[PDB]
Design a protein around this ligand. Sequence first.
Ligand SMILES: [Zn+2]
Ligand SMILES: [Zn+2]
Ligand SMILES: [Zn+2]
Ligand SMILES: [Zn+2]
Ligand SMILES: [Zn+2]
Ligand SMILES: [Zn+2]
Ligand SMILES: [Zn+2]
Lengths: 786, 307, 70
Amino acid sequence: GLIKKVTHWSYDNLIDYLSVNPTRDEVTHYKVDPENESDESIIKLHTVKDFGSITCLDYSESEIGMIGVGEKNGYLRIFNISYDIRVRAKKQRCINSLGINTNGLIAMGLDRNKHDSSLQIWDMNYHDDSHETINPMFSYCTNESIVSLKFLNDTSVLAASTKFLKEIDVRSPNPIYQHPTRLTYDIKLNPFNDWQFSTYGDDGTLAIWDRRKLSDASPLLTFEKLVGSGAASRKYMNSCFRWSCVRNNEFATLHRGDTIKRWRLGYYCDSNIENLFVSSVHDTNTMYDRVATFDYIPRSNNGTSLICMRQSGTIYRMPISEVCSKAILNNRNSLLLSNFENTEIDEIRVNFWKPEKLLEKDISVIMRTRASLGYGLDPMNTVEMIDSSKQNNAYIRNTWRWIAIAKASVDDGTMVSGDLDLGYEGVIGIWNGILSDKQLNKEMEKIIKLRRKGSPKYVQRRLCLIISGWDLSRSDYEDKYNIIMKNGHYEKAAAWAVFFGDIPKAVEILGSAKKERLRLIATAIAGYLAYKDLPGNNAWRQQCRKMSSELDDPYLRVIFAFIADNDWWDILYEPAISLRERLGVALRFLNDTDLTTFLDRTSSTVIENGELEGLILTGITPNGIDLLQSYVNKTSDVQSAALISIFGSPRYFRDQRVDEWIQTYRDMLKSWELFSMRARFDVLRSKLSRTKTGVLTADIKPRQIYIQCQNCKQNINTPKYCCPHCGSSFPRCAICLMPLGTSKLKLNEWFSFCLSCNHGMHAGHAEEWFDRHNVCPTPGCTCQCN
Amino acid sequence: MQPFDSGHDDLVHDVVYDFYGRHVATCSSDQHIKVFKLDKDTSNWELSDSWRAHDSSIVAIDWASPEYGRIIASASYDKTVKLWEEDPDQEECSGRRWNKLCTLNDSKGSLYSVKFAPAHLGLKLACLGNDGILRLYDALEPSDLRSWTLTSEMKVLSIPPANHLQSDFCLSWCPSRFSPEKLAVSALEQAIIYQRGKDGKLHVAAKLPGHKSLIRSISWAPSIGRWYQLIATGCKDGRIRIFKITEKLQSNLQVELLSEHDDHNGEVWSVSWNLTGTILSSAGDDGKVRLWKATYSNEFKCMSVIT
Amino acid sequence: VLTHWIENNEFGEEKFLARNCNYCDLRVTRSSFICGNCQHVLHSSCARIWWEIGDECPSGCGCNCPEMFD
Ligand SMILES: [Zn+2]
Ligand SMILES: [Zn+2]
Ligand SMILES: [Zn+2]
Ligand SMILES: [Zn+2]
Ligand SMILES: [Zn+2]
Ligand SMILES: [Zn+2]
Ligand SMILES: [Zn+2]
């Protein structure tokens, strides 16, 4: 089987093909359309049959249709498809190779004859058609069997015998070189590099040769056992290696008749001669197995398709898949795709799941949008911004509400005074205690006795009520009820009334509401006041338990759970209600021996579960940093960890994880070009690293530059219009001729000193000058300062 | 999924984003580097500069951190590493916008991968080629960015690979500012994590097991603040191996495989992480790009598949 | 007046980070802004952007640069 691709014959975009069946009997001409993948593009035009057993084939590029056909008997049947002459050598033997040059020279590769020369070249315009034998214009290679030959140029020819590689010209009888090697079968020329060709041998050891390396003799490349055997045994070989016609330093080989490997080559010059080496190997499986030979198809936009002929002679068309070479991601969650075949690059912007929806739901772009909106800079502002957004961010709003409460407590002077700090602490730290016990107890009582205008741990429960924000008055409780009712959350108002115990007020609040369902719930709640003395296990409590099981609202769920049975333990473990309310109803109504167990259980749950609402229990402490670390492990949200841990870490405890989170968030803000947010984050870190004394514990950048005067070589200002150490005159502005002054920032107040030419102007003057100019305004400076 | 044509005359070998994400540089096999920028008005990629860089095909480029300026590395098959700095006062699309800085010729082999260091180690650099020798280049002088001095030289393979056998090399640095310096180095069927010891010389710290075939891409997941680090491996098999590296020779470190997916049925060419290490983009021989995320468990599950 | 960098004996990255703007963390070479109380650089564009919205030094040293740059 031989599929030979012929160009320069079709005026259209189609590519002509010449095919020989694997039994070596017929010659078929095709015209293949590259733009349609289906098999209808392979148009079978002509077929000439009964050509004995074909051993070689060639084509003439000068005139269209001249297709020489060889045979085993010796007849070199040269005819046209798009007359018919039958020539032969003077001695009848098998023709093993064939080449037709551009000018008209036609060579022929014969077997080994002692009294005849193998390589016989004649011209078509200078041959007599009345004789079967030929008139060899140039003859070489006596007593040798030439198995492969090809025309390099209009004069020279590269022929290979059974043992030598010969570069023989017609201008001189002396060949350029004769290299002794066995790999001398099927010389194929690279359509891009004219100095490179590839042969193979009987063992399949393919080798790429360089002509200039042999002329001077190692092969440029070798491939042990690459292609099929039978070179020295069978004269009918399937071409299982083809040079690439679409890009340089590439070729394709066929292995076991089913897979096709495209080997892409790399080249380096030791300094014209490039020492080749294999870079990448791409494997493509054919559509149908048992393929004998294949051929390339030059497609538009540097595409590749493979027309292949099977062992049965059936010809089909196998496209090459567009395999992605590189799929890089981005800080903005953008995917960039590069291909192994064409030039263009695919981009998936952010603007089985959909790609854009998955890139929009990732936490990277969520963190980017939150950082652009100003998340975490002010806790009350971020509670306001989260609450005025509907998605369903529940724990974030509650933990930022607690952070706002604790920051208001610290800013008011509460629980920062005394001999010990006790700032941003949690419920667990207050409850477990841990220099004298009486001294800390009396200063903690003094901490209680600051806003004064039957339990043993009353000097700790009150501190937990202060920390959690549950030390509010009953008139302010009525005001809070009015606020929650005005917000529209009637169920939360009812839940707070149930929490604070005034069940008739819960009935009054849920009654006369905007919904009929809330009125039905109010009637069910009111059916409890005249009912709480009942022993239980009755149909009303069963109905209330069923309603608690079935209902979707968590506030009414815990309302029904408290109404049906007067126990708080069904309320303290409900996760859908906020943990601040649960801690309020745990400090208000629970024995200390049970409150300690509840605190231990809830703290051990929230440390490992990564819940951000556990910061009420644990505070911003090392255990709070453990909580935030587990939250980062579960969620990959370093933004919230940074904005929470900056409140208490460098003020109180040096730990490496907070520094990692701060540096990561600063690099993320620089990555999204949010330099303003990074600067606000840095000044907020400096504000929140101040101790009670006032000493800044944050790490600041060291001092960078200072201004000299070159008359006393000192600083002109101490951390007037004259130098304060030598009295020399300061340089003036180049625009308004006003000097430098040394002793809410307006533009016309500081010099914008260039660090290259050392010439200073006022910033308003520099903006007005450098907007329409690009040179230093001083007389004799060439420095583009803007 | 709008495409843009890079304008190269040959294959495109490596495309990298910059730090800010608004610039891409595209190396190619026609010895050219084209830098593209994102216009905020037209919202389309446009060429900033195109220039002939090396004497062979360029296979890897990498941006430097912007605190060091606009520096683009370039490793190619002509055994050269060319470093390019952008001149601010130069015309657009002229070829003289990016000024050549150095040509590191210390490697006696055709290079495959160049990777700049993170922004906590210095202005370091890494190279690997078909010579088995790892080379590190530090720019120790902040006054001039041309005295690039070789500092570390570790041999990875015993012998250089054969002329005909194909082989791949890839690098990935550890971007953790609060951990000892580590380097993930892939050589054929071996993936080794180096570590900077107390003597200033790298040592073999941990080897990733598995890898029955060639390794086509190593990507270190960004250290967002977690207690574990992740390495994504694209092998010549179908396997996208994710390794959970826990660190606790300054510090010992353990390697545990987290996931191993055969969901491509071919060679995995490029695997790459996101900014936060949440989305893993794997491109394989099936023509489809598969995204991976972790939901409700440590094991990574599949997601949207882009073909 | 010539602007003189503080010759700080440094070893690693702070040698490179000495000559960097405190708003964008890029190298400053032309048209800088220098405070006197704190010795920190800014670009002219970075200073004209930051002082429209900020009040302290963007490096967070606690220096009120609109009132202490003299
Ligand atoms: Zn002076
Ligand atoms: Zn002026
Ligand atoms: Zn000047
Ligand atoms: Zn200047
Ligand atoms: Zn700046
Ligand atoms: Zn400052
Ligand atoms: Zn200042």
